[PDB]
């Protein structure tokens, strides 16, 4: 019904009281594997959940995705007041309580919830993000997966402040509906860290210099809320 990503205009986005402080628990979370999907890097996880906020119940974390561009100042999927970040990380959660599978979740409008964490290149070597960079050797080829071989805690990638926007959109490939949670505050990384992501390959062959998607028009019946 409404395609993702979009541009979130702060002037137009309203402030709703139902958007309470978000309960984020990635204490149980641990990465199982890392993948080169042909489009992007994707880390799969076991454990952890999100809750509270505007959610009717907790949604269990499923996967992590990473998006980037050919230029350091233009790589996010989502924009905020027509501003684009260096890259975007998506965290896909699903309704384990209601539905008996992730594939059943995709089929429904209340099935998926996707957090967005922005990456901004700021001349700061992120100690935590480097642990993902160290795995990129094992998935250089297109459509290859290796087990994630490192101690890694996901809640070290959360921003400083956790105020957020939210809207009914879709998954990036438009395969299913998904309620987005967009954190305006980004996390800091170095250019050399993102540089290694461009040395991955894809479906003739060519390096993945960029994998983001261009924004869409906000529908008449789609409003963006704010914490």
């Amino acid at each position, epitope marked *: 019904q409404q395609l993702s990503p979009i541009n979130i205009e702060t002037k137009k986005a309203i402030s709703n009281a139902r958007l309470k402080p978000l309960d984020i628990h990635y204490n149980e979370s*641990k990465p*199982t*594997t890392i*993948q*080169n*999907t*042909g489009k992007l890097v994707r880390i*799969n996880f*076991k*454990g952890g959940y999100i809750s509270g906020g505007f959610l009717p119940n907790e949604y269990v974390l499923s996967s992590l995705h990473i998006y980037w561009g050919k230029e350091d100042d233009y790589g996010s999927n989502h924009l905020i007041d027509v501003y684009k970040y260096s890259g975007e990380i998506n965290l896909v959660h699903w309704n*384990k309580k209601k539905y*008996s*599978s*992730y*594939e059943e979740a995709k089929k429904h409008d209340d099935g998926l919830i996707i957090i967005s964490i922005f990456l901004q290149v700021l001349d700061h070597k992120n100690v935590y993000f480097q642990k993902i960079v160290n795995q990129l050797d094992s998935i250089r*080829s297109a*459509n*290859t*997966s*290796a*087990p*994630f*071989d490192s101690v890694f805690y996901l809640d070290n990638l959360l921003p400083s402040k956790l105020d957020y926007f939210t809207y009914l959109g879709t998954t990036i490939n438009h395969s299913a509906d998904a309620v987005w949670i967009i954190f305006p505050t980004p996390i800091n990384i170095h250019s050399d860290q993102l540089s290694k992501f461009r040395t991955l390959l894809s479906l003739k062959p060519h390096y993945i210099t960029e994998n983001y998607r261009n924004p869409y028009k906000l529908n008449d019946d789609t409003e963006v809320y704010y914490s």
Partner: antibody
Amino acid sequence: EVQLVESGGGLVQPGGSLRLSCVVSGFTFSNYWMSWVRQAPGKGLEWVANIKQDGSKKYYVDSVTGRFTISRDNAKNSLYLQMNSLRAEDTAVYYCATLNLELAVDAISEALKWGQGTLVTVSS
Amino acid sequence: YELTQPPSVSVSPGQTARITCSGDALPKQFAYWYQQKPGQAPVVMIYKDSERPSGIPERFSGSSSGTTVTSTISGVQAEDEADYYCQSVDNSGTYEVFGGGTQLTVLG
């Protein structure tokens, strides 16, 4: 739909050699790690070995290492298993299957089916 | 590295069965559960701990806590009399393993 038509071997002399094969259809074989599982008559399931999509990583049991070897051809869309120096304890039904959905690109639930298997009897 | 499950479990029709596996890498790695009937290949009942395939009855459900993973069959039917094996990788993620296998015998 998914089908894992496990062709391959049969009777072979002890210490001999064989090459099983597993043709696949219904899902992107290229994206999955693939694995061989065996099951002796009236016995449990034993994982034999697995292989990475490109074939740059292969892992076996902490026995059977120096004589078994996996291969695969993604164009012909099939999994293979050379096995030399065969024993009586290698007498089993050999199953071709994807086990791990975390080690697979665009993972689907449908691709966890198992085939019928090929009986490998080792006897003098 | 091996996955430990009880070789035998006995239940009566209409009762809630529970078959549990143990392993050091279960905090890291997901498990799978395969039903096997006489003269037939293994078939998945539950995957990734708690995800049921289409076709499998709602009776079958899976839960996880720490180093244990527990397949659960509610209102068990005689249909369900079969061996159930749990499947997982070691903590490196390279060496795949099956459990000993649990013979689920239905009484009465």
